C-alpha cells in the first residue's frame, strides 16, 4: 500500500512474462507501475498486435522477442512473400526504444535495411539472435559489425543469408572486444581467417564459437589455442588428409579447452579425426552430430565416453545397437534427436527401428524429450515407451511412409499413441504419424490435457477427430494439420476454442472457402487467412476447399501486408 519506487523495486525481482501480466491486473495503480518498468516483451505471433501498441504501453523495454511465419514454413508449406517482415518493428522502435539492448527474431523476413537501422539507432545494442530468418545479406551484417560497439552476441542459427562476401567480419574495429557469442554456422561464404583469429584473440569473454564450415579442420587448433575458455564450440569442416602432426595438434588444442560443455558442427567428418575430440568428452552435456555421416560403430566409440551427456542430436546411422549402448552409458539423458540420413528413399538404408527408442526408453530414467525419424513402429513399442517414461514432455515421432500401419500387426497406431497420451500426463508436445483413425484423436481429446502443440499429417477419417481435439484439449496453444479429412463441420462447431489458442494451421484439408467466410464473420477477432495460389476464391464455388487456411487471434485486426494470394475473411 506504499509508494512508487518500492513497488517498482519490488517488480524488479519479477521477470516471468506471466508474473508481470498478473501484477498488471491487480489494480489500475499496478498496471501503471509495471508498464513503466517492463524490461522485456515476448511476442509469439508478430501479427497478434501492432508495434504502436507495444511501444506505447511498455515504453521502457530493453529486450524484444518476435516470431513470424507458422512452424510449417520449415516444410516449405507457406509460399514466399506471405509476410513476417520485421521492418515496421524496427522502424517504430528506433525512435522510442533508445536504450534497446536485445532483439530475438524467429522466422521473420529481415532486411539489410533493418540491420542498418538497428545498428544506428541502438547505441547500447548487445544481443542479436536471428533464428531461421531470411532477407538479408552479408552487407547487413557488415553494418552491425562496423557500428555496434557494445555487441556481445551474434547468433545466425539456421538462417538463410544472401552470401555476398566473408569480408563483413573484418568490419569489427580493433577497439571492439566485447563478444560473448558468434554463431556463424549457416553462412556458405568464407570469413577472413586472420580477421577471425584477431577477433577471437582479443575478446577474452568469448564463450561460444560456432563456425562456418569454410574454416577447415586444419585451422581449428589455431582458433582453439586463442580461446581456451570456450564453453560451446561449433567446428567448421571436419575433414583433412590423414596426418599425425595435424591430429596431434587438434588434440593438444582441444584438451586445452577444459570448459567445453557443447560440441557441434562436424561437416564431412572423417572417422580418423573424431577421437581428437575424446578428452573433451568426459564433460559434455550437449553433443550434436547431426551432420556427421559416420557409421554406427564410430559414433558408439565416441558416445562411450560422454557419461554426462544430457542432449544428443545424431544421424540415424547410430542404429538400434548404437542406441542400446547409448541407454547404457548416458544415465543423465534428457533429450534425444535422431534425424533421417536418407529421408527421401523408401527402403531402409540403416538398421534403425522401434527398437532403439525402446532401448533408450528403458535405460534413461530422465529422458523427457524425443524427436525420432524411422521407417517402422508398433503399437507394442509405443505402449512400452509410455509405460517406461511417464515423465516424457515432448514426443515427436515421424514415420517416413505416410500411412504405415503397425508392421507386425497391421493395425492403425491408435493404441500406441493412446498410450503415450494416457500415460504421459505432462506431455506438452506431440507430433505423430502412421496409420491413424478418428480414434487416436479421441484419445488425444480425452487424455492430452496438458498438451500445447500438436502436429499431424495424413490422418483421421472425418471431422469427429479434429472435433475431439479442439474439444478435449484444455491446454492447446498451437494446432497444425496437413492432408487430413478435417473441414467445415469440426472447425465451426469449435469456433470459440480458437480465441484461446495462438494459431490453427490447416493445409490440404477439406475446409470450404464458404466456411472460411462464415468463420471470419462469426469471429471478428480472428484473422482467418486463406492462402491459395490458384487466384481469387470466387473463381471457384464456395463449396471448394481452399489450399491452406491459417487462423490466429489478434488485437491488431487484419494485417496490412498481405500479398496477392492471401485473403482475410474479415470484411
Amino acid at each position: 500500500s506504499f509508494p512508487e519506487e518500492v513497488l517498482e523495486h519490488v517488480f524488479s525481482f519479477i521477470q516471468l512474462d506471466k508474473d508481470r501480466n498478473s501484477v498488471s491486473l491487480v489494480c489500475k495503480s499496478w498496471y501503471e507501475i509495471e508498464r513503466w518498468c517492463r524490461r522485456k516483451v515476448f511476442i509469439g505471433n508478430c501479427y497478434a498486435v501492432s508495434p504502436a501498441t507495444v511501444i506505447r504501453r511498455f515504453p521502457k523495454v530493453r529486450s524484444v522477442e518476435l516470431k513470424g511465419k507458422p512452424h510449417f514454413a520449415d516444410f516449405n508449406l507457406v509460399p514466399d512473400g506471405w509476410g513476417g517482415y520485421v521492418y515496421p518493428w524496427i522502424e517504430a522502435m528506433s525512435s522510442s526504444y533508445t536504450w534497446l539492448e536485445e532483439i530475438r527474431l524467429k522466422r521473420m523476413v529481415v532486411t539489410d535495411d533493418c540491420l542498418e537501422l538497428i545498428a544506428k539507432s541502438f547505441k547500447n545494442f548487445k544481443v542479436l539472435v536471428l533464428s531461421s530468418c531470411e532477407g538479408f545479406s552479408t552487407d547487413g551484417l557488415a553494418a552491425i559489425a562496423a557500428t555496434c560497439r557494445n555487441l556481445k552476441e551474434l547468433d545466425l542459427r539456421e538462417s538463410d543469408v544472401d552470401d555476398v562476401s566473408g569480408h563483413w567480419l573484418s568490419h569489427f574495429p580493433d577497439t571492439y572486444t566485447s563478444l560473448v557469442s558468434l554463431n556463424i554456422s549457416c553462412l556458405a561464404s568464407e570469413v577472413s581467417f586472420s580477421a577471425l583469429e584477431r577477433l577471437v584473440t582479443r575478446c577474452p569473454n568469448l564463450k561460444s564459437l560456432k563456425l562456418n564450415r569454410a574454416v577447415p579442420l586444419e585451422k581449428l587448433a589455431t582458433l582453439l589455442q586463442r580461446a581456451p575458455q570456450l564453453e560451446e564450440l561449433g567446428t567448421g569442416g571436419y575433414t583433412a588428409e590423414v596426418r599425425p602432426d595435424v591430429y596431434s595438434g587438434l588434440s593438444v588444442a582441444l584438451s586445452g579447452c577444459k570448459e567445453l560443455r557443447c560440441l557441434s558442427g562436424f561437416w564431412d567428418a572423417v572417422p580418423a579425426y573424431l577421437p581428437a575430440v575424446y578428452s573433451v568428452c568426459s564433460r559434455l552435456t550437449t553433443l550434436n552430430l547431426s551432420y556427421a555421416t559416420v557409421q554406427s560403430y564410430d559414433l558408439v566409440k565416441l558416445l562411450c565416453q560422454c557419461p554426462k551427456l544430457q542432449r544428443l542430436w545424431v544421424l540415424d546411422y547410430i542404429e538400434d545397437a548404437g542406441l542400446e549402448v547409448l541407454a547404457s552409458t548416458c544415465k543423465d539423458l534428457r533429450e534425444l534427436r535422431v534425424f533421417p540420413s536418407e529421408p527421401f528413399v523408401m527402403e531402409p538404408n540403416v538398421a534403425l527401428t522401434e527398437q532403439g527408442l525402446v532401448s533408450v526408453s528403458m535405460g534413461c530414467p530422465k529422458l523427457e524429450s524425443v524427436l525420432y525419424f524411422c521407417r517402422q513402429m508398433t503399437n507394442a513399442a509405443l505402449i512400452t515407451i509410455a509405460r517406461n517414461r511417464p515423465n516424457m514432455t515432448r514426443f515427436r515421432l515421424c514415420i517416413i511412409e505416410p500411412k504405415a500401419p503397425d508392421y507386425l500387426t497391421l493395425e492403425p497406431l491408435d493404441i500406441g499413441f493412446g498410450a503415450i497420451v494416457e500415460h504421459c500426463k505432462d506431455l506438452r508436445r506431440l507430433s505423430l504419424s502412421g496409420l491413424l483413425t478418428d480414434k487416436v484423436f479421441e484419445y488425444i481429446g480425452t487424455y492430452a490435457k496438458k498438451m500445447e502443440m500438436l502436429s499431424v499429417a495424413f490422418a483421421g477419417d472425418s471431422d469427429l477427430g479434429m472435433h475431439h481435439v479442439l474439444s478435449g484439449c484444455d491446454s492447446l496453444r498451437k494446432l497444425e494439420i496437413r492432408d487430413c479429412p478435417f473441414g467445415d463441420k469440426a472447425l465451426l462447431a469449435n469456433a470459440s476454442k480458437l480465441e484461446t489458442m495462438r494459431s490453427l494451421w490447416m493445409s490440404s484439408c477439406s475446409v470450404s472457402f464458404g466456411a472460411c467466410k462464415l468463420l471470419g464473420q462469426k469471429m471478428p477477432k480472428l484473422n482467418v487467412e486463406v492462402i491459395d495460389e490458384r487466384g481469387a476464391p470466387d473463381s471457384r464455388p464456395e463449396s471448394c476447399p481452399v489450399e491452406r487456411v491459417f487462423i490466429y487471434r489478434t488485437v491488431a485486426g487484419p494485417r496490412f501486408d498481405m500479398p496477392g494470394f492471401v485473403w482475410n475473411m474479415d470484411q
Partner: peptide
C-alpha cells in the same frame, strides 16, 4: 513423394 514430406529441412523432395 509428397510436398513437404517427410517434414525435414533437407534438400531434395
Amino acid at each position: 513423394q509428397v510436398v513437404g514430406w517427410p517434414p525435414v529441412r533437407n534438400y531434395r523432395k
